[PDB]
CSV table of C-alpha atoms in Angstrom, one decimal:
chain,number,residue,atom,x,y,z
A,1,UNK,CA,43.7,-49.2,22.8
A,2,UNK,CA,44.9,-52.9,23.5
A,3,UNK,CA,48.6,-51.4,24.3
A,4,UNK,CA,47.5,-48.5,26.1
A,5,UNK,CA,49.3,-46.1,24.5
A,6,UNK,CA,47.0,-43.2,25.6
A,7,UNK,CA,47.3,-44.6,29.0
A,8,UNK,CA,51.1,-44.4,28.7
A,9,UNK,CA,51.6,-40.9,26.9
A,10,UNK,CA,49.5,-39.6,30.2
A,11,UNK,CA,51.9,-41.5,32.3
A,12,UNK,CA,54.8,-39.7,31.2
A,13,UNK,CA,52.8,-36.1,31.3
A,14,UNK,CA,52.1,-37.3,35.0
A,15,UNK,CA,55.8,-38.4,35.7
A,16,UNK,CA,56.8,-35.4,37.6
A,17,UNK,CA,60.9,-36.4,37.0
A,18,UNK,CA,59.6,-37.0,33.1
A,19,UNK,CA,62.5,-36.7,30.3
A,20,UNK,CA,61.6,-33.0,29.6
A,21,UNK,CA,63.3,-33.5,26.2
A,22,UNK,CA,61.1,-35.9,25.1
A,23,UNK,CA,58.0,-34.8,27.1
A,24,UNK,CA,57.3,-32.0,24.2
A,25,UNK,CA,57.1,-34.8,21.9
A,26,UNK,CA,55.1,-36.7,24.1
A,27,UNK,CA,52.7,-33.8,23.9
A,28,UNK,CA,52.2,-33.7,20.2
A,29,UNK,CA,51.6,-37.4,19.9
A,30,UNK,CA,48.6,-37.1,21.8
A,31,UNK,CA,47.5,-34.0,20.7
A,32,UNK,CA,48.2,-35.1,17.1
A,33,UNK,CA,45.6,-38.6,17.7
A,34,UNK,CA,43.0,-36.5,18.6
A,35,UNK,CA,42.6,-36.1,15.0
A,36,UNK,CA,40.5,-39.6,15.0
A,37,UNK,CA,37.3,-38.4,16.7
A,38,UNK,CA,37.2,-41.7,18.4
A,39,UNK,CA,40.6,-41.1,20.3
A,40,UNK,CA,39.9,-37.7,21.0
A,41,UNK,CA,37.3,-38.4,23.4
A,42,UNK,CA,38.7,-41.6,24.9
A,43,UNK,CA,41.6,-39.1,26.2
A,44,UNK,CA,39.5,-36.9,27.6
A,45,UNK,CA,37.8,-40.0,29.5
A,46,UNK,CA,41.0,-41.6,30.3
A,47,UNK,CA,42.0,-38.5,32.7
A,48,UNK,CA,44.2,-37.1,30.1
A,49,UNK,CA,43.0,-33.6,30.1
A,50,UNK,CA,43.7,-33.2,34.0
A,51,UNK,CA,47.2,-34.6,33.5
A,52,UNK,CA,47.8,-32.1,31.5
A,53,UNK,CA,46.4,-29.3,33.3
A,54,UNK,CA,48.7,-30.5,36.0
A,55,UNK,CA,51.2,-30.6,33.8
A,56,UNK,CA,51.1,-26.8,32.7
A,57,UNK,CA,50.4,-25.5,36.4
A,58,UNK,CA,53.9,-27.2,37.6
A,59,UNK,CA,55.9,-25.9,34.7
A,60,UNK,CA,54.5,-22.4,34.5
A,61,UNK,CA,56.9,-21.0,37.2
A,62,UNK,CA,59.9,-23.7,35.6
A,63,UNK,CA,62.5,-22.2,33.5
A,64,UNK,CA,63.2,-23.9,30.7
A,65,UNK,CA,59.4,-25.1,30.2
A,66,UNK,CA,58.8,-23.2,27.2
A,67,UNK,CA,58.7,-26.0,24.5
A,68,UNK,CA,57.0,-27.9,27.2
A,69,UNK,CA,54.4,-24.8,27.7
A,70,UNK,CA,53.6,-24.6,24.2
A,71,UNK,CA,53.0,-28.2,23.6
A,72,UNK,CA,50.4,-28.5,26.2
A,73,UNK,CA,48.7,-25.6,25.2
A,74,UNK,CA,48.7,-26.8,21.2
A,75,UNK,CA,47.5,-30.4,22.5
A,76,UNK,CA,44.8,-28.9,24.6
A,77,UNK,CA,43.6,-27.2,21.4
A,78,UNK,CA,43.9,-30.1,19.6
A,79,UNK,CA,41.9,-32.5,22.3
A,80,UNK,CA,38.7,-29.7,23.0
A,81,UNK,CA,38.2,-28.0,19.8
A,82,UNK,CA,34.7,-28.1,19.2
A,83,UNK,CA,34.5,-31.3,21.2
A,84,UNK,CA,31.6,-29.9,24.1
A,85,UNK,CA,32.9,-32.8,26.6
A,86,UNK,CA,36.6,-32.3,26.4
A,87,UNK,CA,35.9,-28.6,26.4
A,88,UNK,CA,33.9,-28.8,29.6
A,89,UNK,CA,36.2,-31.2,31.6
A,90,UNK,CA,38.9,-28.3,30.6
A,91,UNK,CA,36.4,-25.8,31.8
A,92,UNK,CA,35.9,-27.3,35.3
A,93,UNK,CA,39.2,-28.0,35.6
A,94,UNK,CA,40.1,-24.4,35.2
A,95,UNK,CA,41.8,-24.6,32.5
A,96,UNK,CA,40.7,-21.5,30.6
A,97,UNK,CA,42.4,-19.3,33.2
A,98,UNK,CA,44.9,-21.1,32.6
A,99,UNK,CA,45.1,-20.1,29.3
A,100,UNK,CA,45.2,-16.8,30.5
A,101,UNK,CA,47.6,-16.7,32.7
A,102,UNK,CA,49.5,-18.5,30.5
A,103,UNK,CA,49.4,-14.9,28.3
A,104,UNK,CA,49.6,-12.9,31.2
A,105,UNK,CA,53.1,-14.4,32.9
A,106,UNK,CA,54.5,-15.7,29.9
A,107,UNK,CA,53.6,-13.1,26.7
A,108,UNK,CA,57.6,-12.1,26.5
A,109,UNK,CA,58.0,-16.0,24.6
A,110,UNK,CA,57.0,-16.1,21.2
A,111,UNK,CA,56.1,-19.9,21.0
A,112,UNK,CA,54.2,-19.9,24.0
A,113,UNK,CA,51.9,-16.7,23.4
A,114,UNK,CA,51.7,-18.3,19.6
A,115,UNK,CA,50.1,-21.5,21.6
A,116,UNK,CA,48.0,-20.0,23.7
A,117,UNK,CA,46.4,-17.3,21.3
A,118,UNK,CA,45.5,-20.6,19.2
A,119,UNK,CA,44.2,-22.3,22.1
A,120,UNK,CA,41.5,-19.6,22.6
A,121,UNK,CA,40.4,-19.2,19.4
A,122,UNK,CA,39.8,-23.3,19.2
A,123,UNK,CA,38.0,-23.3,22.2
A,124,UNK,CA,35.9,-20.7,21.2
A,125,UNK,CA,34.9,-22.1,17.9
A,126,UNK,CA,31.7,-23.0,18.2
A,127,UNK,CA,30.9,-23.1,21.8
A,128,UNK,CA,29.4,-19.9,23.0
A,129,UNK,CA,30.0,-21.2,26.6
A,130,UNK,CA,33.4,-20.7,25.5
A,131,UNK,CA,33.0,-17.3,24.3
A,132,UNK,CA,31.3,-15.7,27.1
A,133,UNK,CA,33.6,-17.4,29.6
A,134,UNK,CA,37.0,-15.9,28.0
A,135,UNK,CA,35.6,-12.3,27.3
A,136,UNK,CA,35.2,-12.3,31.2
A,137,UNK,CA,38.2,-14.8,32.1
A,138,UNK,CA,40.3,-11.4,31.6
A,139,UNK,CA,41.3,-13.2,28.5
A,140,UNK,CA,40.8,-9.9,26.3
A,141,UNK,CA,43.2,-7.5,28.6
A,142,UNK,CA,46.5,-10.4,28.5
A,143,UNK,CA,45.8,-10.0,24.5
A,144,UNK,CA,46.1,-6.5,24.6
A,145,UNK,CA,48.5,-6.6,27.4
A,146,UNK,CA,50.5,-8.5,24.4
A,147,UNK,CA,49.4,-6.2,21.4
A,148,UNK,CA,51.1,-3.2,23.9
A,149,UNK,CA,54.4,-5.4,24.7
A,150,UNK,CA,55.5,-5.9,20.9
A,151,UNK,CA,59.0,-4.5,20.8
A,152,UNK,CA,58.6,-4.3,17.1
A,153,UNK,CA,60.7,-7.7,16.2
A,154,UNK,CA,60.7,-9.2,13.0
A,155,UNK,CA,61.7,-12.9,13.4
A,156,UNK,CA,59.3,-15.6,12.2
A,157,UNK,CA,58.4,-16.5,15.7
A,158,UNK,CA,57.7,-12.8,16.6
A,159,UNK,CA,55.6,-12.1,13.7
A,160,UNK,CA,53.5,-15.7,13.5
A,161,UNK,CA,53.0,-14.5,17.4
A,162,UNK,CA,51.3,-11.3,16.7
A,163,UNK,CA,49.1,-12.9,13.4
A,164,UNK,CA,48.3,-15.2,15.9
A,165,UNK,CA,47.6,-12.5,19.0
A,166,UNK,CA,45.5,-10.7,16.7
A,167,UNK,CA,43.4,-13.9,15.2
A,168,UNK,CA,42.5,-14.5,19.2
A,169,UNK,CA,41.5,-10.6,19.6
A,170,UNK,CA,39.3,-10.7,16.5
A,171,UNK,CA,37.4,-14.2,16.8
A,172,UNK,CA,36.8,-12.5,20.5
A,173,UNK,CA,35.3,-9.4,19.3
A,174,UNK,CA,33.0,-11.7,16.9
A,175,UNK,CA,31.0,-11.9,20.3
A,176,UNK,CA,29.7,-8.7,20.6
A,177,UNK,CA,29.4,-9.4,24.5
A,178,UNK,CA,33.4,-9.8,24.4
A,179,UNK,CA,33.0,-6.6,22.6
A,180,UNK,CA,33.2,-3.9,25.2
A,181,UNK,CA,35.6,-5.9,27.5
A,182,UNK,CA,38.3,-5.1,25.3
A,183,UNK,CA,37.6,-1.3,25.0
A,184,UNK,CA,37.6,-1.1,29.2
A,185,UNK,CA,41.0,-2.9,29.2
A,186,UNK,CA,41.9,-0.4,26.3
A,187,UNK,CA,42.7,-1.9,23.1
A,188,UNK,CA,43.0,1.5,21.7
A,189,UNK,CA,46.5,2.5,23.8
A,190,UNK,CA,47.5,-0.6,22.6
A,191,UNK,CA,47.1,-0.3,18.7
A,192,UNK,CA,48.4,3.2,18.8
A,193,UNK,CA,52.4,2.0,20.5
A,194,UNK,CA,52.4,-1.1,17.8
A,195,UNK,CA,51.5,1.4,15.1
A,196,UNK,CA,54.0,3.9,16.4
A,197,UNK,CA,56.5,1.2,16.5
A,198,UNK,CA,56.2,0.2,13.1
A,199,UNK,CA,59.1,-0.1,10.4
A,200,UNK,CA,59.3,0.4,6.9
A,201,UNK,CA,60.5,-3.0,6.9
A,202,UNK,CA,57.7,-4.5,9.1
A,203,UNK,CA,55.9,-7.2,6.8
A,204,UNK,CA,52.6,-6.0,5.0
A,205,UNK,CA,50.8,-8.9,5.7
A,206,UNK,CA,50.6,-8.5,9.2
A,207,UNK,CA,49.6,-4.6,8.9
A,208,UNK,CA,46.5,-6.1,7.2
A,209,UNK,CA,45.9,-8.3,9.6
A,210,UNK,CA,46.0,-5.9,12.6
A,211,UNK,CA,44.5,-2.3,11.1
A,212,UNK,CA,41.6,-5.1,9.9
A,213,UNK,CA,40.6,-5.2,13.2
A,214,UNK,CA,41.0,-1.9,14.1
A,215,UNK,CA,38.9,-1.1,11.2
A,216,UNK,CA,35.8,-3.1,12.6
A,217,UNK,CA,36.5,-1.4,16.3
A,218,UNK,CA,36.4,2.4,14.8
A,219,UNK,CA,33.3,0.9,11.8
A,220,UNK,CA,30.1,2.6,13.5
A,221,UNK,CA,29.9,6.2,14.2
A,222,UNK,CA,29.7,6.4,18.0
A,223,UNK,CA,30.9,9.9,18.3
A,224,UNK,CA,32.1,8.9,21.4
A,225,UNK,CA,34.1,5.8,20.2
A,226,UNK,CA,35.9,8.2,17.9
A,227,UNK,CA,36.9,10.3,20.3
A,228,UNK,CA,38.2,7.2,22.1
A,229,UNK,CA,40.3,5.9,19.1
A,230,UNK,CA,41.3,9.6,18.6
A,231,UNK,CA,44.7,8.4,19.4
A,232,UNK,CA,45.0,6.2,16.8
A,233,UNK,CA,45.0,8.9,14.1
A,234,UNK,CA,48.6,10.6,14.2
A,235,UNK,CA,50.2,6.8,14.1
A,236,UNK,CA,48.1,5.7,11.3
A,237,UNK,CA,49.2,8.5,9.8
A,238,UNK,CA,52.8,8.3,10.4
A,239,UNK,CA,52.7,4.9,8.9
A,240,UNK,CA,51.2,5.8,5.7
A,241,UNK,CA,53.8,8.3,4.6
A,242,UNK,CA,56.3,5.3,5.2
A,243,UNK,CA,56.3,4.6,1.7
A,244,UNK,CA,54.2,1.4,0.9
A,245,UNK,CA,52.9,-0.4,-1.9
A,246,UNK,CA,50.2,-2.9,-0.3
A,247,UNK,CA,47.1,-1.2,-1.5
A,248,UNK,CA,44.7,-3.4,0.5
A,249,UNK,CA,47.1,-2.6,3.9
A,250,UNK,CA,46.7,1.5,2.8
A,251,UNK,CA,43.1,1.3,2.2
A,252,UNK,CA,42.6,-0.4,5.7
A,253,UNK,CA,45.3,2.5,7.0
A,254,UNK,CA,42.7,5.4,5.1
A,255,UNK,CA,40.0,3.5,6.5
A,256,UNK,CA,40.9,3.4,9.9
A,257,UNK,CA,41.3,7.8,9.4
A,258,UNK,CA,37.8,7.7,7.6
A,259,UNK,CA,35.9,5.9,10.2
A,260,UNK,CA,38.1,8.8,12.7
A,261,UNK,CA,37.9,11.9,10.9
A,262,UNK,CA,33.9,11.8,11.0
A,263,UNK,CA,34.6,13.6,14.4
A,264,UNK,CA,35.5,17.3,14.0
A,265,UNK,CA,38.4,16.7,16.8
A,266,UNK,CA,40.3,14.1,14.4
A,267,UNK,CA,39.0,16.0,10.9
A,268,UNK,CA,41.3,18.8,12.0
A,269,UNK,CA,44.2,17.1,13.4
A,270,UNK,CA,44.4,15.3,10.1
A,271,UNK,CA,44.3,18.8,8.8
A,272,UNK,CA,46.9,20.1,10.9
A,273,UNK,CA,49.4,17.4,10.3
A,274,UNK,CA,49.7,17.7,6.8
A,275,UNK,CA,47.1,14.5,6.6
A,276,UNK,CA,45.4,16.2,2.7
A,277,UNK,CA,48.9,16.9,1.0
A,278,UNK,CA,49.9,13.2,2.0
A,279,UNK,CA,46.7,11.8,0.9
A,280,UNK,CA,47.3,13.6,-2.2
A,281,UNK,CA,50.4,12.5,-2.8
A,282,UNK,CA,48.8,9.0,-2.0
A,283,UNK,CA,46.1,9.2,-4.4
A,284,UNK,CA,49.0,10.4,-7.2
A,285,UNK,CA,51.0,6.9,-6.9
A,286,UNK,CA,48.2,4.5,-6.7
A,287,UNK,CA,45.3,6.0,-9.2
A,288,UNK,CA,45.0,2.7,-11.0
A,289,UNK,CA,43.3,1.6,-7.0
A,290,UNK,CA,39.8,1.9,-7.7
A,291,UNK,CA,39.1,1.9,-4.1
A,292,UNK,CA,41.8,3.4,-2.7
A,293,UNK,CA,41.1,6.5,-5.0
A,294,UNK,CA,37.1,6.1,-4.0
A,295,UNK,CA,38.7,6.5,0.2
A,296,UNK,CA,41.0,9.5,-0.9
A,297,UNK,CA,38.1,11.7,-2.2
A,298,UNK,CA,35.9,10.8,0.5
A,299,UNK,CA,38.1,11.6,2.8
A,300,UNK,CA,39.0,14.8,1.2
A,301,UNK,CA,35.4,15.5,0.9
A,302,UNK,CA,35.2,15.5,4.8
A,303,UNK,CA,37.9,18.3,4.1
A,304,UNK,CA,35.8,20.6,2.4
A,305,UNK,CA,34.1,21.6,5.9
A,306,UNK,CA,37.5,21.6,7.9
A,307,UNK,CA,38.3,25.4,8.3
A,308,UNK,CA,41.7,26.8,6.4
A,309,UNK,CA,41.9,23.0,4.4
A,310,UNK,CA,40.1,23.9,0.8
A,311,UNK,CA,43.4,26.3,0.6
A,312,UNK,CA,45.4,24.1,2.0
């Protein structure tokens, strides 16, 4: 405090001609002193959340911003995670749409969308204010907007993205306001390209991660909702014949059908598609999987009303 270093790392965010290689480092250091509570919500009071809201609104249309971008985003979830004043100074600053435009113009860069994802999910922790607020901010359609714009990339930025996408999407959904938001901007179209994208080689962990989510979407048995996530079926399907050994990712995969197949439409297109002889084949490899043998005869059992399937 007595040499003004807060005072003079929100000088340089202000300095419109700032050193823009060492502004991103500028941006960390403040963000990273917010971790004394005290210093967290002296920034706030010594303008520093509006200099950096000013900040991110004249780099957003800036090439060569993204480190810049990222930073700002990370230190805003660093200053107003569950701190009510920082977050509302953010709020009336307009900061969460922002956020979400931040997604919306700039989802093709993996450290940026990475950023911003965790900047939702920190804002929502623990104010509801927060939560409402995003579910409406059009928040939900930029993450699915995302979820349908994966090319299928596997580098380390690509993939900490997506875990990262998919955190925001599901401590959304945990408002079951925010719930329905995300099935108007379709979610569903969405998790069916990433799924029918997939690779062999795609990493395990993040399958979990995702078809978790889906699993809680598809969980209740609104006829109609099935019919809705009817085109996730084929894909799920198509990804469990890959060849996999994650149990926990193949139970979530069965799941996902489960949940599906309680609709006639869906029972028989599992049918149809040769869905029982690779369940079968499934259920061969991995009979020491207590659970994933328990979701293979359940979902057989379903099969037992399916017409021409008992032969089959």
């Amino acid at each position: 405090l007595k040499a003004n270093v807060l005072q003079r790392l929100i000088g340089i965010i202000s300095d419109v001609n700032a050193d823009m290689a060492l502004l991103p480092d500028v941006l960390f250091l403040l963000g990273s002193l917010a971790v004394v509570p005290e210093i967290k919500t002296k920034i706030g009071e010594l303008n520093g959340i509006a200099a950096c809201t000013d900040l991110l609104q004249r780099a957003l249309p800036k090439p060569n911003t993204a480190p810049v971008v990222t930073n700002v985003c990370l230190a805003f979830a660093n200053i107003c995670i569950g701190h009510k004043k920082n977050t509302e100074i953010f709020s009336k600053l307009g900061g969460p749409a922002l956020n979400v435009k931040v997604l919306n113009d700039r989802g093709h860069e993996y450290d940026v969308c990475n950023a911003a994802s965790v900047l939702l999910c920190n804002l929502l922790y623990k104010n509801e204010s927060m939560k409402k607020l995003l579910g409406t901010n059009g928040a939900p359609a930029a993450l699915v907007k995302g979820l349908s714009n994966y090319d299928g990339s596997e580098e380390k930025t690509a993939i900490r993205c997506l875990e990262s996408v998919f955190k925001a999407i599901s401590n959304l959904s945990l408002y079951t306001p925010n719930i329905q938001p995300f099935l108007d901007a379709g979610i569903e179209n969405a998790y069916s390209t990433w799924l029918s994208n997939l690779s062999e080689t795609f990493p395990d962990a993040q399958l979990e991660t995702g078809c978790r989510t889906l699993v809680n979407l598809v969980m209740e048995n609104e006829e109609n909702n099935m019919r809705k996530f009817g085109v996730c079926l084929l894909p799920c399907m198509a990804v469990a014949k890959q060849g996999r050994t994650d149990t926990k990712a193949l139970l979530l995969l069965l799941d996902i059908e489960a949940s599906l197949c309680r609709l006639k439409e869906n029972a028989e297109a599992f049918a149809a598609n040769g869905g029982i002889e690779t369940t079968i084949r499934l259920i061969h490899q991995f009979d020491y999987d207590v659970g994933l043998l328990t979701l293979g005869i359940h979902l057989l059992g379903i099969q037992s009303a399916v017409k021409d399937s008992i032969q089959r």
